[PDB]
Amino acid sequence: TLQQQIIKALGAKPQINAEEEIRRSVDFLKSYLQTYPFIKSLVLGISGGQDSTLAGKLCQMAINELRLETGNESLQFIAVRLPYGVQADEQDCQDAIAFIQPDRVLTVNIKGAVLASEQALREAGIELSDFVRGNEKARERMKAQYSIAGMTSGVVVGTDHAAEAITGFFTKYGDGGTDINPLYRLNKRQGKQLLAALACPEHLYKKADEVALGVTYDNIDDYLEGKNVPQQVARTIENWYLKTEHKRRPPITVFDDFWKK
Amino acid sequence: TLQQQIIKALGAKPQINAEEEIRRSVDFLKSYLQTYPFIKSLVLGISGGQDSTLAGKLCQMAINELRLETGNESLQFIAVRLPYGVQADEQDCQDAIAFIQPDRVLTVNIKGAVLASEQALREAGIELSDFVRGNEKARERMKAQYSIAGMTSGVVVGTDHAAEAITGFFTKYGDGGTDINPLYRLNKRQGKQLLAALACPEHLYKKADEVALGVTYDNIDDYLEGKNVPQQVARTIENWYLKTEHKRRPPITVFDDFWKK
Ligand SMILES: Nc1ncnc2c1ncn2[C@@H]1O[C@H](COP(=O)(O)O)[C@@H](O)[C@H]1O
Ligand SMILES: Nc1ncnc2c1ncn2[C@@H]1O[C@H](COP(=O)(O)O)[C@@H](O)[C@H]1O
Ligand SMILES: Nc1ncnc2c1ncn2[C@@H]1O[C@H](COP(=O)(O)O)[C@@H](O)[C@H]1O
Ligand SMILES: Nc1ncnc2c1ncn2[C@@H]1O[C@H](COP(=O)(O)O)[C@@H](O)[C@H]1O
Ligand SMILES: [Mg+2]
Ligand SMILES: [Mg+2]
Ligand SMILES: [Mg+2]
Ligand SMILES: [Mg+2]
């Protein structure tokens, strides 16, 4: 079935072992850095939400272990705060930072750049809708992170996971534009499982997308776990998947044929 | 050999038929638009250089033919000028536009946005090198094009081809961040062949990268055509290819193993 094919493509499992998955992600990050020794930093945008809090903790753990094992003091995890003006859940971001205990935290306000981009487009004749402005913000955040990685010999860590990949619920070349994604394979509730195992404060992942999707995260997680969900729900999820295949593949060329089916 | 594997992966051929390749690219663009009818525009940044001039002409031809065939007057090709302040070869851009005869030309000056992004980074403690600033400009151009595509129901056309893909000579999520690439498979001199067949003014592609690469475009084209080049030259090209595999694949996950070889 299509459900079977999607589960296989995203690497999702019905149940996972929290600590075992924590080690799988940490060891992954450590192995990559030992294979490419010129990389001295891991860069990640912290939003105060579940996914970035989890990824952030895993990144710091990876660097902490590599330092002790190799003695290389130049390695570091750089957490990046990218507020648009004044961010609402700022206190949550502070709590997330306290939990992660990052080596370094840089704060870059993207408002000025976004307004400038919009002014240039307006003068040319293009006014943006709120939806498009949202993607523009996601792309400015990508830009900031890559400029930081470029000056610190680092790579940009992404928070993409199975529950977001299946619906293509990310901005193309926005938060989707990253170098390495240690959470890929996990669904939403499983991410909470890892945070619980890390003793993360409950309020940082205890409830917050479901509006635009037409399905809840529980529907998506159940689907990814191979469960039997209402047919109408399955069709909605599958429609999103097929519609967004372009977001999970490199630019289309004359050799591609996936879009012909 | 590695040369054989690379040629296969990029789809390059020793010799091509100019008109036949022109039709292959145009028919490709037309087929995609007929498969996804919600797409009403093709968006492409025009720089006055060889690659964008070629891609631009092919895009306009595709739209011209689709309009006559379907009668749909809402379809259009949008050429986008994205100068950083005052562009040097501006006259060449004007000549390129005269050759392409685009339905619409929008001019968006990216200088304001780039300076704003740099100011935000500077205040946080990050000063950019000229190289990194260059990538930042490429990413702001990507941002502008996607905002335009978002408001015009369009897709972003890329100019990536075999001679650039082999060395990864493009900005990750910059000019490399596109939706559909009609030139993919062609080497540099072959691109000139297509322009000659289209009667493009010679000065628009007659000579202009080779500095940073350590090899000339003729070395790269010869390599892609399966020719026997000096071993030192082959090793340099192959080094670039292996080093930039991350640019030609989606973000790295725990399931990938290409980087382990
Ligand atoms: N306010 C923010 N500050 C820093 N990073 C952000 C911000 N908002 C989004 N991000 C990053 O974008 C990722 C994707 O967010 P989301 O769009 O909610 O899936 C998060 O995991 C963060 O890494
Ligand atoms: N079917 C498609 N094939 C290739 N690119 C597309 C397609 N549908 C949408 N896009 C591109 O993806 C963008 C929407 O992605 P996002 O900005 O992430 O919401 C549109 O502005 C187009 O540039
Ligand atoms: N000045 C510019 N104006 C508009 N598009 C640009 C500009 N410079 C670069 N581009 C776009 O980026 C692509 C890649 O350029 P290149 O970095 O020279 O390989 C070109 O084919 C254009 O589509
Ligand atoms: N070996 C690698 N694996 C994954 N990402 C990398 C690697 N080498 C470089 N990068 C990323 O790609 C960027 C360089 O690409 P560019 O900006 O196109 O010159 C660096 O700033 C890193 O974010
Ligand atoms: Mg969020
Ligand atoms: Mg998220
Ligand atoms: Mg150029
Ligand atoms: Mg080019």
From Swiss-Prot, chains A, B:
Keywords, A to Z, come to: ATP-binding, Ligase, Magnesium, Metal-binding, NAD, Nucleotide-binding, Phosphoprotein
User: Which pathway does UniProt place it in?
Assistant: Cofactor biosynthesis; NAD(+) biosynthesis; NAD(+) from deamido-NAD(+) (ammonia route): step 1/1
If you read the UniProt record, what top EC class would you report for this enzyme, in one word?
ligase
Question: From what superkingdom does this record's organism come?
Answer: Bacteria
For this chain, the family text in UniProt reads: Belongs to the NAD synthetase family.
This protein's assembly is summarised as:
Homodimer.
> How is this protein named in the record?
NH(3)-dependent NAD(+) synthetase
Instruction: State the organism named in the record.
Output: Escherichia coli (strain K12)
The protein's gene is named nadE
